[PDB]
Amino acid sequence: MDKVYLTWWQVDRAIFALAEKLREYKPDVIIGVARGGLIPAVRLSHILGDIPLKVIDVKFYKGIDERGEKPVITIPIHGDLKDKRVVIVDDVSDTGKTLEVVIEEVKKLGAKEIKIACLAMKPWTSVVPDYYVFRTEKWIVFPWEEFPVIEK
Amino acid sequence: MDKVYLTWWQVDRAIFALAEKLREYKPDVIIGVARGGLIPAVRLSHILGDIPLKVIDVKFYKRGEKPVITIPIHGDLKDKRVVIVDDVSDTGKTLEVVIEEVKKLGAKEIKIACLAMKPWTSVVPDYYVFRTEKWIVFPWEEFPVIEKE
Amino acid sequence: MDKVYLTWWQVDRAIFALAEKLREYKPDVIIGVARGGLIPAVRLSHILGDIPLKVIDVKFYKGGEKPVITIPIHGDLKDKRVVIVDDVSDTGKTLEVVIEEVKKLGAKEIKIACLAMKPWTSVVPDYYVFRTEKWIVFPWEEFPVIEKE
Amino acid sequence: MDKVYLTWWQVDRAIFALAEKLREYKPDVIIGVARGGLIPAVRLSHILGDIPLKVIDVKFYKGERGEKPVITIPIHGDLKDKRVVIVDDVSDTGKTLEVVIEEVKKLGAKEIKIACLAMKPWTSVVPDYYVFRTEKWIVFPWEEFPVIEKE
Amino acid sequence: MDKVYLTWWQVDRAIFALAEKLREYKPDVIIGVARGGLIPAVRLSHILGDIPLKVIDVKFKPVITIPIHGDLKDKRVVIVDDVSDTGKTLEVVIEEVKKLGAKEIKIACLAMKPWTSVVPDYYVFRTEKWIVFPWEEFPVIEK
Amino acid sequence: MDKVYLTWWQVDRAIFALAEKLREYKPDVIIGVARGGLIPAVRLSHILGDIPLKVIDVKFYKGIEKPVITIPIHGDLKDKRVVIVDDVSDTGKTLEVVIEEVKKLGAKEIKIACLAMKPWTSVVPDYYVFRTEKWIVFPWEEFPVIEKE
Amino acid sequence: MDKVYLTWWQVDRAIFALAEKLREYKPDVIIGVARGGLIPAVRLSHILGDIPLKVIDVKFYKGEKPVITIPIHGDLKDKRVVIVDDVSDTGKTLEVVIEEVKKLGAKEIKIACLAMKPWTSVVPDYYVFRTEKWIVFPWEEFPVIEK
Amino acid sequence: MDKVYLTWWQVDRAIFALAEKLREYKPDVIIGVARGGLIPAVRLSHILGDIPLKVIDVKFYKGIDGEKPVITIPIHGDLKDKRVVIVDDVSDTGKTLEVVIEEVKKLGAKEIKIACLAMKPWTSVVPDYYVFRTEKWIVFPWEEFPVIEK
Amino acid sequence: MDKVYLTWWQVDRAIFALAEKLREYKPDVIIGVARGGLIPAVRLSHILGDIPLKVIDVKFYKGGEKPVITIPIHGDLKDKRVVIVDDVSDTGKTLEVVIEEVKKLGAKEIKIACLAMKPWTSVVPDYYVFRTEKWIVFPWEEFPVIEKE
Amino acid sequence: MDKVYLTWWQVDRAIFALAEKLREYKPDVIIGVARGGLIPAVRLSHILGDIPLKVIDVKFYRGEKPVITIPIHGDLKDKRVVIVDDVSDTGKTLEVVIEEVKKLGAKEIKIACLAMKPWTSVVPDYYVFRTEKWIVFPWEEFPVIEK
Amino acid sequence: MDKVYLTWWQVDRAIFALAEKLREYKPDVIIGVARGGLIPAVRLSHILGDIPLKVIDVKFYKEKPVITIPIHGDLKDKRVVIVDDVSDTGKTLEVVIEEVKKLGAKEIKIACLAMKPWTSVVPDYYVFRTEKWIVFPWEEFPVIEK
Amino acid sequence: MDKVYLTWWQVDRAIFALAEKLREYKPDVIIGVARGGLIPAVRLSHILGDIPLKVIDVKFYGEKPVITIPIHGDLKDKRVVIVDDVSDTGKTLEVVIEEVKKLGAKEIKIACLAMKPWTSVVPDYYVFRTEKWIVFPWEEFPVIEK
């Protein structure tokens, strides 16, 4: 087993730890990255005084290039975030691909300050989270994810 | 006790059970109600074969309470079989706002699935697992603390 | 069961118990919110020395929702010790409107008495007997019948 | 014991009986006459498909503050084009029902009907619908008892 | 108010009273006379060790709306009715029970009036007024 | 029917009536006269701030009637306001035996509260609610059965 | 509590409530499932217009098999029937009655019960109380736990 | 709800049921326990053939701060060759009943039997006869309906 | 709520508790009824010293309704102390069969152990933990879903 | 059911919720009542900033009398104390502890519990669960009913 | 710690995944191999429309296999599915396949939660692949004494 | 992830396993080592027939030991068992053993959930072995910032 299976208690404790740290930052709004992002996002929305939750969904297709992928925003976020402390919540920063796209949609809305929180991150990511709990190189199977079946 | 504190497992086993019954329905799109609907919708979305996911947020503001659409449903739903997902149908006040909002978009067929439902609701879910009148604390919600006064 | 069916006696004994504690407060006026509060207001009114009885009716219409005063209360209660009587404090929405209307009559001190209250209400009664989350059918209400859809 | 002590089950049954006769009349609004008149008026409001309830309070004072019938709680909104039913616990002399009847007409009531739990042989206002007849004083389920002290 | 309005607590205590007296008799079966009679019949049925219950309905002339079958041969019977007013119905019931050859026959009622032609073997209330039972509805007086 | 059958609601409302008068008296202890007497005694005990309850049982024998105390009053009653409670004062014979037993325990003051009284009783209660000449069947009493001779 | 002890008054109010709904159905006949359904039937009979009252009694003896101790008399052809029982728990007694009522060929069939348990195989058409707990009806004897 | 409010009727019916099961026992004396079982004992006494009624009252006094039990209303004489029935309203913790039992045993009861209307699972004294079973707060008909104030 | 959803851990703690009490009984063989008792019996099998595990499956078919032993017990249980393991003793019909069936194999002593039991069962387990009248959904069963008929 | 069986996760979420409120009270010391309050005290201790931890064990043995098996060590003069326990049932154990804490001159005292029963004489300043049922906590052994 | 400790949520999720593949196969009967096998067997039994469940137990003595809990009845024209916790050597699974064939199994499929790479019986469906010993949620632990 | 995250179910089973071994020993009293050690100690206190529990708390800042919560009473003629979560260096357990001897403990046994290879004090009963930092079910997690 070269995969990491995070339990729900591991995710709850991780979220509680992040919360205490995000309290010093005082977020005005949360932006959850779908789909895994929305678990920590919803919980943080509650734990931090029911602060507004915005949802964004970024998806990737192969497009007209073989070596390359262009982002298609499934679920957008609206309204402006001028003078608003923003905190983007996602489950893990693997390549940082999705996060970079999200940081650009948050700036287009005039985000005052921007912080990034994740449950875990991988060493090579191009977007290190400002706050995270787990560090690993393996593939992470979260408590809310199903398992693949191996057939002959 | 005064409240029901649903564990992640109990909610997960309910999402699976709900998914099994929703296969027969074959949803084209899943509409999750913010915020209690989100987690369940995420899991059902993938279990049902990575079907498209949409979000809708309804807040009520105070004489009298008027509903506000925090996050509107993007795109249209013409000819699509829709499924509105929520954690619980309590009064059915939010669900009724969603139902109409989906109808504006052109859902071929609308179906509602909830983890729980309360006997006195005005919107009986087409699919639900838990039934109670008690105060329900879902795993993603904060455990309320009672203080003095 | 799914509902609590309070018998006339259980309610009579609660009204008696509430009067016993309301003596110390020495009410000058009793505001019974119809319709659930009227029968209890009538009895407390007499037990407490035949004190003046006023009535208020608040109805909530749908089309958001705004409250409409079906039966308004009049006459200033300047420096009068008022007691608001109702059958139950459920969400607290009605009792909040009744409080606003009593204060509009210049009420000195306001106390609230109910036979029952639900743990999630916004207006906890200064006096109550029954505490539950279940569906409450008071003796004066009709016993609901469940019919197939 | 020269008094008639009505149980809640007698009051409940008397109310279900009045409901059946009242369905035929198809009341549009109920006017409850305080105080004991509210118990029956409320119950009928529910049984008859939640028809709107209005309250009227009539008080006959005697010896300060008194001259003739005073209307403690008035009824408002016109009843123009409405079938009205006036509910009270008992029509003893009818002094009260008469004043109420006058306030209703004074509001334009399309038609008027009277229903009570009981009535006494000497009333000047015989209810269109009622259940008990007696000359004794009635102690309803919702009333307290006086105590007899030596003195 | 020239009527007697029995409460459920009066009816319940009447039954418990009857039951203790009926235990000395040891009924093998109970014959309940619809309609008001079923109430006491049912209660005595459970109270007396869940003994068999047969329902007989007599309407008036005399036509049996609900017949009782089987033979009460060598079976001590107790006929349960709410009130023995004139005795008319009860006398008809006494027949059908003998026709089935009952080892013995006893009658138990809640009430009974002075003039009845059939005095119950066991009863509780005696009156001359009309009895309105807990399970009955009330008439309305109109103009 | 030549008997008066008192319901529990009649008995409760009587006891509540008696209680409000006994509050002006502020009794220190209650002497409940078994057996029927024990129902209103226990209730008044609870209604008047759990004031202590003592029990007394008086039986009569064919006087060659002579009284016999089955259950005596424990302790003494020096400097305490007393209230003797019974269901009904019929002849007054029982109450008289009790008034005497109370006095010889040195009761400061003495009061008598009954549910009912009959016109010819020798001991008129200081407080009562029902007056009748008929035999009274209380809510806690069973009925006799009329068999054939 | 372990059990539910319905009072005469509660039962009576349920009956009045059921009757109000049953009016729209205009029953031609009422069949009281004995013994529990009898008392409710009697009242429903008078309340709906002194409509005919038939009685049925199905006893289960021990696998197991039913024994109709008191069969329904006459035929119900072209008649709208209403079966009345105190509670629909398992539903085994009612199913044996729905059939027996079809034999006599009934026009329409609706079931009216005071109570109903969630796991019942026979969800009545009209009911008031809903519980999973042990129900003790007024006419039944209060159970006593001994050692 | 938070509490169970038994009606007089529910209590009367339970008393009848207990009486019926007690008939086989054939009690000689009924020892009502104050204050809860007084009313039930009064009724049981008559129903079971006017058998003599005795009363015992046990109170707990807090020392100057535990709790010590003291007999407020004693039982005179003895209970030799007498089949007894101790009647109470409910057997919650069983503390009271245990004291009443020791006293009854000291008076030489031939046989003892406990009968209560209610019983709580965690009790140290399971009644020999009982009807209601719950863990909730029980308000008997003879008690005051509790009011909650701020 | 309307149903009880025992978690794996709750069931596990129950099994450990039962195992501890059985240690005194020293069971020779464990008989799990299918399918509810299988999982519990496996754990108790190992915990109690890797004692042999036999299986029995009783199903009920309608016409009346009688039992059919889908999986009989293998071997004989002479002079052995037996322990029947089941998830819940609801009505007791299933266990009654299993008992006769085990008695046929001539068991020295028979003992019943379940996780749960209902008040009305005709077969009170010798060892149980949970007690309820509600619908019990064990971890191995599926979470029922309610759909609109 | 007859008893409530709180899971480790439910207790842990209660403790996390409780800690958030206790943050506003700025405790100086935590007194964990044995044995039930020890586990929640340990965790609360750490979460609130490793604030010192005292332990007290009160047992009950003519009549019933409280005995302190483990006394609090040190003094609490001027300290803002927090007494931690699993459940406030009757309230008799918490009463003895409040007295013992005062004997050490505690300035402010607060009581934090996971659960509380409605008839308790010591209503907690902070609690999560409310019920009258028999509460089995994760650390207690599941009770087995035998014959 | 050299062992793999599997949680109940892992076992449940693995079972739900297996069941979704087994629906395409539409089994008629499930054969759970005692003892650990009965866990997933019982669960799949319910998940797949309560299809019948037979139990088989294979022990070994010196090796020579002995069936301690035989499965009776026939599987003629019945797509069978054998369920177990883990396929290690495959030793036991082979003895089970033989017994299933000896009863007329129309088709045979094997579903396991896990499998070691060196097994002689690679399951048609499995979820976990490991070389370490696996401790399942229903298993007790050894105490290292002195 | 170079840390080991124990679950409550792993701890519960560890505790149950240890408990069966401790029944052979029959402890008179248990000595829980705060703080993580209280979890096992309380649990064992209950499982082993509610035997008396005592709490001790040692702290360090060379590295001098500071007893934050002492124990008292004579453990004369009493078989004692010290319970801790993990025996890493053996540092705390040496102090605790000292405190128990000063009370004249008849026999002393040590029981931990886990232990590490280099410990100066090897538990008489333990379940897990590791060289990694163990994160218990009741502990919080550190957050990594920039």
DSSP secondary structure string, D37-85? Answer: THHHHHHHHHHTTS--EEEEEEE-------SS-EEEE---S--BT-EEE
The domains of chain J, with CATH numbers, are 1-147 (3.40.50.2020)
In one letter, which amino acid is D14? A
The shortest C-alpha distance from A10 to chain K (Å) reads 13
* I10 DSSP assignment: H
Q: Which residues on D lie below 8 Å from E141 (Cβ)? A: 129-131, 133
Task: For residue F9, give the nearest of C5, D12, H8, G5 by alpha carbon.
Answer: H8
Q: Say if the Cβ atoms of G12 and D9 lie within 8 Å.
A: yes
The shortest C-alpha distance from B119 to chain C (Å) reads 8
**What length is written for chain A?**
152
Phi and psi of C101, rounded to 5°? Answer: -75, -30
Taking the C-alpha atoms of residue J122 and residue B64, their distance in angstroms, rounded to an integer, is 40
The per-type count for chain B, helices as H runs and strands as E runs, is 3, 9
Whether residue E35 has a cis bond before it, omega within 30° of 0 = yes
Task: For residue F37, give the nearest of F138, F120, F110, F142 by alpha carbon.
Answer: F138
Task: For residue G90, give the nearest of G132, G41, G140 by alpha carbon.
Answer: G132
Using DSSP's 3-state secondary structure scheme, residue L15 falls into helix
Using DSSP's 3-state secondary structure scheme, residue I41 falls into helix
Tokens of L77: 């003629």
Between the alpha carbon of residue B27 and those of residues A17, B19, H8, L104, the distances in Å are 37, 10, 57, 73
Query: Which CB contacts under 8 angstroms, 24+ apart, belong to I41-46?
Result: I41/I85, I42/K34, I42/K35, I42/K36, I42/K38, I42/K39, I42/K138, I43/I12, I43/I15, I43/I19, I43/K138, I44/I15, I44/I18, I44/I19, I44/I83, I44/I85, I44/I113, I45/K35, I46/K35, I46/K139, I46/K140
Q: Closest residue of C to B67, CA-based?
A: C64
Q: How was this structure determined?
A: X-ray
The residue whose two tokens read 């803002």 is J80
* I13 DSSP assignment: H
Q: Say if the Cβ atoms of L4 and K1 lie within 8 Å.
A: yes
Q: Closest residue of B to K9, CA-based?
A: B9
Whether A91 and A120 have beta carbons less than 8 Å apart is answered as: yes
The shortest C-alpha distance from I7 to chain J (Å) reads 9
Between the alpha carbon of residue C98 and those of residues C74, C83, J101, the distances in Å are 12, 11, 46
The residue whose two tokens read 């348990």 is G117
Please tell me which chains touch G, using 3 or more CB pairs under 8 Å as the contact test.
Answer: C, D, E, H, I
Nearest to K16 among A1, A8, A146 (CB): A146
Taking the C-alpha atoms of residue I85 and residue I138, their distance in angstroms, rounded to an integer, is 15
Task: For residue G9, give the nearest of H123, C7, H95, H70 by alpha carbon.
Answer: C7
Contact residues, chain E to chain G, C-beta under 8 Å = 8, 32, 34-36, 38-39, 42-43, 45-47, 52-55, 57, 65-67, 69, 134-137
Taking the C-alpha atoms of residue B31 and residue B36, their distance in angstroms, rounded to an integer, is 12
Taking the C-alpha atoms of residue B39 and residue B55, their distance in angstroms, rounded to an integer, is 11
Whether C5 and C137 have beta carbons less than 8 Å apart is answered as: yes
Tokens of G87: 């509670």
Largest CA distance in chain I: 54
The residue whose two tokens read 């349920």 is G14
Q: Closest residue of I to J8, CA-based?
A: I9
Task: For residue L103, give the nearest of L28, L10, L35, L26 by alpha carbon.
Answer: L28
**What residues are paired with L83 via a beta bridge?**
L32, L111
- What is the C-alpha radius of gyration for chain J, rounded to an integer number of angstroms? 15
Resolution value (Å, 1 decimal): 2.5
Q: Which residues on C lie below 8 Å from H144 (Cβ)? A: 17, 20
Whether E81 and E33 have beta carbons less than 8 Å apart is answered as: yes
Please tell me which chains touch B, using 3 or more CB pairs under 8 Å as the contact test.
Answer: A, C, I, J, K
Using DSSP's 3-state secondary structure scheme, residue J104 falls into coil
Using DSSP's 3-state secondary structure scheme, residue I8 falls into helix
Which is it for strands C130-131 and B146-147: parallel, antiparallel or unpaired?
unpaired
Taking the C-alpha atoms of residue D28 and residue J17, their distance in angstroms, rounded to an integer, is 54
The span from the first CA to the last CA of chain J, in angstroms, equals 19
Whether B39 and J41 have beta carbons less than 8 Å apart is answered as: no
Whether residue A35 has a cis bond before it, omega within 30° of 0 = yes
Using DSSP's 3-state secondary structure scheme, residue G115 falls into strand
Task: For residue J56, give the nearest of J78, J91, J30 by alpha carbon.
Answer: J30
In one letter, which amino acid is I5? Y
The residue whose two tokens read 């005592």 is L54
Taking the C-alpha atoms of residue K104 and residue A6, their distance in angstroms, rounded to an integer, is 44
Taking the C-alpha atoms of residue C71 and residue C85, their distance in angstroms, rounded to an integer, is 15
Between helix G8-22 and helix D8-25 the angle, nearest 10°, is 10
Whether B32 and B26 have beta carbons less than 8 Å apart is answered as: no
DSSP H44-103: HHHHTTS--EEEEEEEEEE----EEEEEEE---S--BT-EEEEEEEEESS-HHHHHHHHH
Contact residues, chain H to chain E, C-beta under 8 Å = 9, 12-13, 16
Q: Say if the Cβ atoms of E124 and F143 lie within 8 Å.
A: yes
Whether J134 and J93 have beta carbons less than 8 Å apart is answered as: no
Q: Which residues on F lie below 8 Å from E10 (Cβ)? A: 5
- DSSP E strands in L2-146: the ranges are 3-5, 29-33, 53-60, 65-69, 79-87, 107-115, 128-129, 133-135
CA C127 to chain centre: 11
Question: Quick one: which H or E segment has residue G86?
Answer: strand G80-88
Q: Say if the Cβ atoms of H46 and F72 lie within 8 Å.
A: no
- DSSP E strands in B2-108: the ranges are 3-5, 29-34, 53-61, 66-71, 81-89
The vertex-L101 CA angle with L96 and L102, nearest 5°, equals: 100
Whether D7 and E6 have beta carbons less than 8 Å apart is answered as: no
Neighbours of A115 (CB within 10 A): 17
Whether residue C35 has a cis bond before it, omega within 30° of 0 = yes
Q: Say if the Cβ atoms of H55 and F53 lie within 8 Å.
A: no
Whether F111 and F138 have beta carbons less than 8 Å apart is answered as: no
Nearest to I133 among G64, G66, G134 (CB): G134
The vertex-F147 CA angle with F145 and F148, nearest 5°, equals: 165
Exposure string over A24-60, b if 16+ CB within 10 A, otherwise e: eeebebbbbbbbbbbbbbbbbbbbbeebbbbbbbbee
Tokens of L22: 């401790």
Q: Say if the Cβ atoms of A16 and J16 lie within 8 Å.
A: yes
Q: Closest residue of L to J37, CA-based?
A: L42
Tokens of B105: 């978009």
Q: Say if the Cβ atoms of C39 and D39 lie within 8 Å.
A: yes
Neighbours of F24 (CB within 10 A): 6
Taking the C-alpha atoms of residue G104 and residue G107, their distance in angstroms, rounded to an integer, is 10
Task: For residue J39, give the nearest of J142, J120, J140 by alpha carbon.
Answer: J140
Contact residues, chain C to chain F, C-beta under 8 Å = 9, 12-13, 16, 20
Whether residue D35 has a cis bond before it, omega within 30° of 0 = yes
* G73 DSSP assignment: P
Which is it for strands C109-117 and C81-89: parallel, antiparallel or unpaired?
parallel
Question: Quick one: which H or E segment has residue J110?
Answer: strand J108-116
Cβ burial of I62 (10 Å; 0-12, 13-18, 19+) is exposed
- In this complex, does chain E touch chain D, defined as having at least 3 beta-carbon pairs under 8 Å apart? yes
Which is it for strands F53-61 and F66-71: parallel, antiparallel or unpaired?
antiparallel
- What is the C-alpha radius of gyration for chain B, rounded to an integer number of angstroms? 15
